[PDB]
Design a binder for this molecule. Structure first.
Ligand SMILES: [Fe+3]
Lengths: 428, 17
């Protein structure tokens, strides 16, 4: 890349020297050396870029967000200076956007990428990176407009196809998403070999009846994305024991299980009381997992945080669960009531993480019509009995009874997770 | 958020170091 303008060429020696100290690993000596060059040559783009890059490296060594915030500002200063080479301008602001996302300043990254796409209107890779910005903030409509433009200029961009297909699939355009996801993955372009697109292509195929879904599940497994054709979670810790169905003894959570089964009617009655007197606290499932039916959930704990208002509706149940941090502290699971009505079929799906196990306590179980498949075995609920499975495996649910089915869902940390992993793992 | 499924482009949230 051409990063030295005319003036920077007259001082290339002084610049390469400081870059040497950085490449060697003496960051503190390089920040001071680029800082002195910026003092001496206030309009040098390469010297400003070097200071920002040394600040970037220093923040990593210290794990400092304050230092990284400084590098982000220095990266912008490179773009305010005069006669900045175009390769240097793009590198500086792309890194600004990238590191802006690591801190969680998504709106800042978006603004930086918008400026990049305006300064360089013909670089499709930047528009593609801007579409990711919109996806990370939850704006699927603006990400759609972007990838449509990319495909209208470069029709064979695989990165844009998979992302466009991902958007269409999230909009419930299952039939329309399959061609974009499949071609995008087959393109082999950079960024297309991602587990998310294998996951969503097979699911789309499974929904329209196409039996080729498992071939894509198999490919994702062979390419290291999925741990198995059945276990297709993507936010995983490797090494944890993996089986569809668990027994209470296998989990080691015998006290939690005994407590739920000994006191099950109490948990049932508080949930029925909310159904009768506070139905609005039951919220519909909003993840597009149903083919048909009514599925609603009343959530007491999520991401290890207690819903104060919900626990006022189920006060005794919440007091009971406080004694068991294996579930109340599961920052990758929930504790919730779940009601399903007749005529409901939940598509085959997996949960996001392998770091939890899911317990089902039966509360109101119709005698017929209710069944849950996990992997290749189908089981039924029983009132007052706990059922334990790993929802990271593909599971499917039917409700073809004559009345409603109420269960209590309790997520626990996977038993083989160390106490440290249980405190560090980001929440889901 | 990713509760029962994996429908979001990202299920986690970045907060820096
Ligand atoms: Fe599930």
């Amino acid at each position: 890349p051409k990063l030295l303008n005319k003036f920077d060429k007259t001082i290339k020696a002084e610049l390469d020297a400081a870059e040497k100290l950085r490449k060697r690993g003496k960051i503190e000596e390089a920040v001071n050396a680029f800082k002195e060059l910026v003092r001496k040559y206030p309009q040098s783009p390469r010297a400003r870029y070097g200071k920002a890059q040394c600040e970037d490296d220093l923040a990593e060594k210290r794990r400092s967000n304050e230092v990284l915030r400084g590098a982000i500002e220095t990266y912008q200063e490179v773009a305010s200076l005069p006669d900045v080479p175009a390769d240097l301008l793009k590198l500086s602001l792309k890194r600004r956007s990238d590191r802006q996302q690591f801190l969680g300043h998504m709106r800042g990254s978006l603004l930086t990428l918008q400026r990049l796409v305006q300064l360089f209107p013909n670089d499709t890779s930047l528009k593609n990176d801007l579409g990711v910005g919109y996806l990370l903030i939850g704006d699927n409509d603006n990400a759609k407009k972007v990838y449509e433009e990319v495909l209208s200029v470069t029709p064979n961009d695989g990165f844009a196809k998979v992302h466009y297909g991902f958007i269409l699939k999230a909009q419930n355009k299952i039939a329309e998403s399959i061609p974009y996801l499949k071609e995008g993955i087959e393109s082999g372009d950079p960024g297309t070999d991602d587990g998310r697109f294998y996951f969503h292509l097979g699911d789309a195929m499974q929904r329209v009846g196409n039996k080729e879904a498992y071939k894509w599940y198999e490919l994702g497994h062979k390419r290291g994305h999925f741990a198995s054709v059945w276990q297709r979670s993507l936010y995983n810790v490797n090494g944890l024991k993996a089986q569809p169905w668990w027994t209470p003894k296998e989990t080691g959570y015998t006290e939690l299980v005994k407590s739920l089964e000994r006191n099950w009617k109490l948990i049932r009655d508080e949930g029925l009381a909310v159904m009768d007197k506070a139905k609005g606290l039951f919220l519909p499932e909003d993840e597009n997992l149903r083919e048909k039916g009514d599925w609603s959930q009343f959530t007491l704990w999520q991401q290890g945080r207690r819903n104060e208002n919900a626990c006022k509706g189920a006060p005794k149940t919440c007091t009971l669960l406080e004694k068991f941090p294996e579930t109340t502290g599961c920052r990758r699971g929930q504790i919730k009531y779940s009601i399903m009505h007749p005529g409901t079929h939940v598509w085959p799906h997996t949960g996001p993480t392998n770091c939890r196990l899911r317990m089902h306590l039966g509360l109101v179980i119709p005698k017929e019509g209710c069944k849950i498949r996990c992997a290749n075995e189908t089981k039924t609920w029983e009132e007052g009995k706990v059922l334990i499975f790993d929802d990271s495996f593909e599971h499917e649910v039917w409700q073809d009874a004559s009345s409603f089915r109420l269960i209590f869902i309790v997520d626990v940390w996977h038993p083989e997770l160390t106490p440290q992993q249980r405190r560090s793992l980001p929440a889901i | 958020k990713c509760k029962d499924g994996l429908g979001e482009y990202t299920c986690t949230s970045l907060e820096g170091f």
